[PDB]
């Protein structure tokens, strides 16, 4: 008991997380390698606590002497939809404005089966997406059914169980290091760096996956470290 | 126990003369030298293992590559200068620089840089022994415009701290992974702006140690 790890941070939907984690606790490695994970993310050009050079004066790039903390600088941002599996990155798509169900269907049309083929996933491959209500809207459910897509069981409020959240941090690190100064550049750097992310990086994310399910069970469905 | 040089320099006599003749100079002297040189920055460095193409969405390096001294991305050629107090002008050279383009670059940028860097009245200009620098026209421009030129030993880039500054600019620009020459040029000017006086000053503060090593090594090649 004392020697067990006890969670300090609660998660909602702990019973659903236990149903997911216990039932997938003995799935084999091939199965996890053939899950196509997916999510959206937002990348800011000027990160809210990135100490960037803001102006040039007398030939020197300058950072401000005095700043007030903020949650959001100017400079704008890009929103992205992406997918990946253990074997590598799938499609990356810039999303414009708020995404609705019809727009989500169009994203899947284009990019889902092309990604699966490019990644050479096996015949029993499974698609993962989160529990946004748009994902079971009539038009989306019909597209998934008509295109024979198998959808992974999924608990709500569980980004610590989707390794794509690690992949986005890798993309952000690569993009940030190229020091973009405008949004056309931010877009092109996101696509270029996504294309460079190593297949072995992706593989290492998925290799670690069953340990996440072990920790969800140990923590009775509360928040994991991941 | 003494350090003994493993690599010879053909111009050890002149190097040893330079170090002897300058080894007593105060730090003020080195802070008032305006160092200068040109450098070429390749878009696709000859042994940079860059991704060359995309196929099936994946960026790819070739399965088999033969070494080369030069890839086909093109390059930018730059003239620059600096002193302990900071960067001077950075200028993109048009094609291949001849003596007239060199005089023109000096017009525009040399004394502007001395002004902006606030060098003392006895500032000195440094540049290497490229035959162009000794031409009737460059030598006459320097004399007419009252520029004092540092006496300079051949094959001695290890004694010009701007070669470190060029490597710093190249590191910064390469890390931004440019994919065309327009970007390469813009990144060079952006990154030059990020190189500050403290960096420049630390290079020059270390300079007497270079002269110490030239003397220890009897004019042969240093580590620098």
Residue numbers in the entry:
A (entry chain B): 5 to 230
B (entry chain A): 7 to 230
The study reports:
SB is a member of the widespread Tc1/mariner superfamily of DNA transposons that has been developed as a genome engineering tool in a broad range of organisms. The transposon (tnp) DNA includes terminal inverted repeats (TIRs) at its ends and encodes a transposase protein, the workhorse of transposition, that catalyses all DNA cleavage and joining reactions required for transposition. Tc1/mariner transposases contain an N-terminal bipartite PAIRED-like10 DNA-binding domain (DBD) consisting of two helix-turn-helix motifs, and a C-terminal catalytic domain with an RNaseH-like fold and a catalytic triad of three acidic residues (DDE)1 that execute DNA hydrolysis (in excision) and transesterification (in integration) in a two metal ion-dependent manner. The 39 kDa SB transposase (340 amino acids (aa)) features a similar domain composition to other Tc1/mariner transposases.
To provide structural insights into SB transposition, we crystallized the catalytic domain (aa 114–340; including most of the flexible inter-domain linker that spans aa 110–127) of the current most active SB transposase variant, SB100X, and solved its structure at 1.4 Å resolution. The core of the structure reveals a canonical RNaseH-fold, consisting of a central five-stranded β-sheet (β1–β5) surrounded by five α-helices (α1–α5). The catalytic residues (D153, D244 and E279) are assembled in close proximity establishing an active site conformation similar to the one observed in the crystal structure of the homologous Mos1 transposase PEC (grey in Figs 1a,b). In addition to the core RNaseH domain, most of the inter-domain linker (aa 117–127) and also the flexible clamp loop (aa 159–190), which is inserted between β1 and β2 of the RNaseH-fold7 and includes part of the glycine-rich strip (aa 183–190), are visible in the structure. In the Mos1 PEC, the clamp loop is extended and interacts with the similarly extended linker and both tnp ends across the dimer interface, playing an important role in PEC assembly. In turn, in our SB100X catalytic domain crystals, the clamp loop is curved, mostly pivoting on three consecutive G-s (aa 188–190, marked with red arrow in Fig. 1a) in the glycine-rich strip, and contributes to an extended protein–protein interface (2,350 Å2 surface area; ΔG=−27.2 kcal mol−1)29 between symmetry related molecules in neighbouring asymmetric units. The clamp loops of both protomers form reciprocal interactions with the RNaseH core of the partner molecule, covering the active sites. In addition, the tip of the clamp loop contains two short antiparallel β-strands (aa 169–171 and 174–176), which form a β-hairpin and interact with the main chain of the inter-domain linker (aa 119–122) of the partner molecule. However, as the observed arrangement of the catalytic domains is too compact to allow DNA to access the active sites, it does not appear compatible with PEC assembly.
